[PDB]
Design a protein around this ligand. Structure first.
Ligand SMILES: C[C@@H]1CN=C(NCCc2ccccc2)S1
Ligand SMILES: C[C@@H]1CN=C(NCCc2ccccc2)S1
Ligand SMILES: [Mg+2]
Ligand SMILES: [Mg+2]
Lengths: 546, 546
């Protein structure tokens, strides 16, 4: 029956509402009760406020008309307004006070997840105040979650006029009995009710969601903690920079503020950051989520030495040069983690701060060839498997879906053993033809990786492992240095390859190192525990990169 | 003979040099002359400074070693260092004092313009100080102008060691007698001279350029004012955002800081901003230079109504939404100028500030259909010529090179008359088959426009002119508003279509409007007078958008 849900902004999706400042201002200032509301509503359908709400005039032009209405109301109530009484002041403060009502947004999100069309229908204004950006940010953050935002001042109609409900219906392509409409103003619900819409009068949020749950039959209250917002690839800004004649890097870009470059691991994608990209943008940063060289829409030349760390890092510096960025924050996971540590040691002037998920910083041992070093740790045997060009490419390319479904697994889900892979003859020799789907991913998300990896396959990616000696010689150049820029290491309890204890000496090289640690988290940290990753990264960004 | 030129950084491309702070610090503080230089050079080839310069240790690790050397030197000279004597302090201050030496950079640029390979060869350090960004910015700004930057600390070798000169030669693919090398340190020139390079010992800049002019035979001093830096399309970051199913917008992006969206006119390109993009990025902004809808790499659907202002503006808001930008500064020229005024009137919450080149803001007349309004001004007759779909497309597409060479002309160069175009039968009916090249453009730059316009031709572009009635009805909705966000109008003396006097009433609608005016400037403002445009935009950005 019900197929659509419509939410007001003031007092429904955002709180405290702004007439709640008309009320509170009267109280705080000991003015005649309702005086500010009288001024606000003066002249009714043709008074200043309606002209505002219909987009006839801007907020800045309205402010002095409200001033005049206040003067008139207080003359007629035979009172004075206090010295320094300021309408601009009151509204600036009310409008910045007003925050997203998180439980109501989460109900709308959930109803949209079960197939509802959702909309915001609000009486609002053209905001040209000096501080208008605050409201622009709120509306951006809210509206991306809905099918439609209908604003009185853009459509030239206002609640409770009946035409705006007809316009709503026509936008929804729904009939009234398929629609629930929530508002904190009863006079605003009446015309929706007249048309036979389900309406809910919102006072406290919980009771409104109780009514909303009853009428839609979906669970909205007491529901588990939802995942952070993810990214839809076709809604992102896609960027492309040529770093040298045969090599272009692709990235996705979202947000404003200090540049934050995310560097994914093997065998992954920009999309491995999908849960971090919207949260970090929301947190005040300019995210650049790379396809690393070898992957996705970035170039993948065939030659092994195109993937040594020296070359990869120089190219990442060029990438900053061509975008006109003097620095970025570098945040890496897995191979990308190893890369950002080398960015910090070789190009500290270009790195505002550095963070790694899982990958520890371990200085090259100048007394042991990296082959031997690798051979001293049974868990790294898969790295020898990767050496011989073509062997791992053929196994990994043979069935892409099976490849990603086998790799991308939570720590409780039959993770592959990295155990005597060479001896066994391959990574999947002991895994099923058709693995089950991890709880971490959807079938759609697996097919995104499959489709990315059909462009270049696994050659470029595997080549990252094929420069052990060359990277060892380059790293030995840095053995006298310390990392003294702001630095964060995030360990994962159940990553059984990049174990938390392998990071234990990092303070000898990075004395002011900060740490986070995520429990019950396997190797695929960003999608295993996206919520915790986001909280640990934002907290460290705000204190150390800002 | 000479084919390459090599410049030192300290004391050659940037001034004051930093040993000049060792000297000045001794004087300011009344220490024994040369004491700070002794500390700095202590231990020679194996002392702390050389290890710094070779990339063995970072600047932050070196600071306390220099401290120790200072202590040792002052013990042996039987003196005390003052209380609060700080090496970090001295160097922070020296390194921010140091600016690009503009005449030396302009000589290097000019030699590169006449075919020299240019390089910077410098002894420098890995900079991990809290304030390292300042130096990162300087190096970015300088290095983009050269073929090679060779840094002692990246290559592990230092002037005056002879191996760094062999490495230089091998980088240049030149023999020593084809190379001139400039340095302010004589001991550094000696090995270049030993190999038979032309060397110049730089004390004052003018005398060094005098020597440089004599030896290369090119004029470097007293030369006219050069153009601002332009953009090479294949060195830019290219971005792409889908704003709706059939419509993607392309833009080029350079810089960090407040977002500044540049909107070009008819029939132009992002590339029309090529002189502004590097200067505005350099000035502290994040430039987004659009292909407007209809042009270049943006989508060009065929339908007329896809190009009405309402649709164009809504799409530009979506473009900000998808990039996660709550606002941008909008700067428009020509049609793009008209568009940004409507962004300011319909979406002031999304526009941080608005500026137009040439295009005035004129409110719709609700008592006169826009056809009649257009017919009341002989100079607008070309707009009627554009109405009939296919007529202007066939003339403009018929020979693209002739099209752009005829349009893009300085005010002194036989500009087309916009005079009775319909009567005449077309825009070019009275222009040559092969126009000469304007002084404003190169033949290469014309062929960039030609190549852009081969993708979609002139249909989409012309469609901007084909929604007169629809835009008039939308504009009438805004007749009660004023523009009260920060706003700049820039008039061009000799634009004979968008005349400066057509802007004369703008203050009635935009009471706090700021202005600039460019004399002896025709219609193609950004390439006619790029230097003046840049100065007027940066000055207004820094005061009003920041
Ligand atoms: C610097 C270190 C190099 N190898 C790393 N982990 C790869 C994890 C992995 C993923 C998938 C299959 C096998 C292994 S990061
Ligand atoms: C809003 C105004 C609409 N027409 C404008 N100028 C087009 C200039 C022009 C360029 C090339 C040929 C003819 C004319 S801006
Ligand atoms: Mg409300
Ligand atoms: Mg020097």
């Amino acid at each position: 029956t019900l197929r659509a849900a419509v939410f007001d902004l003031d007092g429904v999706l955002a709180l405290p509402a702004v007439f709640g400042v008309l009320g509170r201002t009267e109280e705080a200032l000991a003015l005649p009760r309702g005086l500010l509301n009288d001024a606000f509503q003066k002249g009714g359908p043709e008074g200043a406020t309606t002209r505002l709400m219909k987009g006839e005039i801007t907020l800045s032009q309205w402010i002095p008309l409200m001033e005049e209405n206040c003067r008139k109301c207080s003359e007629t109530a035979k009172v004075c307004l206090p010295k320094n009484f300021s309408i601009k002041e009151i509204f600036d403060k009310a409008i910045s006070a007003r925050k997203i009502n998180r439980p109501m947004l989460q109900a709308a999100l959930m109803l949209r997840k079960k197939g509802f069309t959702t909309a915001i229908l609000t009486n609002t204004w053209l905001d040209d105040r000096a501080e208008r950006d605050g409201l622009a940010q709120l509306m951006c953050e809210l509206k991306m979650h809905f099918d439609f935002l209908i604003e009185s001042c853009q459509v030239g109609m206002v609640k409770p006029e009946p035409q705006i409900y007809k316009f709503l219906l026509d936008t929804l392509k729904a009939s009234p009995s398929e629609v629930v409409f929530l508002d904190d103003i009863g006079a605003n619900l009446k015309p929706a009710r007249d048309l036979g819409m389900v309406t809910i009068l919102v006072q406290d949020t919980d009771t409104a969601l109780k009514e909303l749950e009853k009428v839609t039959g979906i669970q909205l209250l007491n529901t588990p903690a939802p995942l952070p917002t993810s990214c839809n690839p076709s809604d992102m800004s896609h960027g492309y920079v040529t770093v040298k004649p045969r090599v272009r890097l692709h990235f996705v870009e979202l947000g404003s503020g200090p540049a934050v470059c995310l560097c994914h691991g093997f065998p992954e994608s920009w999309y491995s950051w999908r849960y971090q990209i919207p949260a970090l943008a929301q947190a005040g940063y300019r995210v650049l989520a790379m396809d690393m060289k070898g992957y996705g829409e970035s170039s993948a030349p065939p030659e092994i030495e195109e993937y040594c760390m020296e070359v990869l890092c120089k190219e990442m510096v060029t990438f900053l040069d061509k975008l006109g960025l003097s620095q970025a924050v570098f945040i890496g996971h897995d191979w990308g983690g190893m890369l950002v540590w080398y960015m910090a040691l070789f190009y500290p002037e270009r790195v505002r701060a550095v963070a790694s998920l899982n990958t520890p910083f371990i200085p090259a041992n100048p007394n042991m060839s990296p082959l031997e070093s690798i051979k001293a740790n049974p868990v790294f045997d898969y790295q020898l498997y990767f050496q011989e060009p073509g062997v791992a490419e053929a196994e990994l390319e043979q069935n892409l879906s099976r490849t990603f479904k086998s790799l991308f697994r939570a720590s409780d889900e039959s993770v592959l053993s990295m155990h005597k892979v060479c001896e066994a003859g391959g990574l999947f020799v002991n895994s099923p033809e058709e693995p089950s789907l991890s709880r971490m991913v959807t079938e759609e998300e697996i097919q995104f990786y499959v489709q990315q990896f059909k462009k270049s396959g696994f050659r470029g990616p595997l080549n990252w492992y094929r420069n052990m000696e060359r990277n060892w010689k380059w790293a030995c150049k840095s053995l006298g240095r310390k990392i003294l820029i702001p630095a964060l290491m995030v360990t994962a309890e159940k990553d059984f390859v990049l174990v938390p204890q392998m990071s234990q000496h990092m303070e000898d090289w990075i004395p002011h190192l900060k740490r986070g640690h995520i429990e019950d988290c396997g190797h695929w940290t960003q999608m295993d525990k996206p919520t915790e990753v986001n909280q640990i990264l934002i907290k460290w960004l705000d204190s150390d990169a800002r």
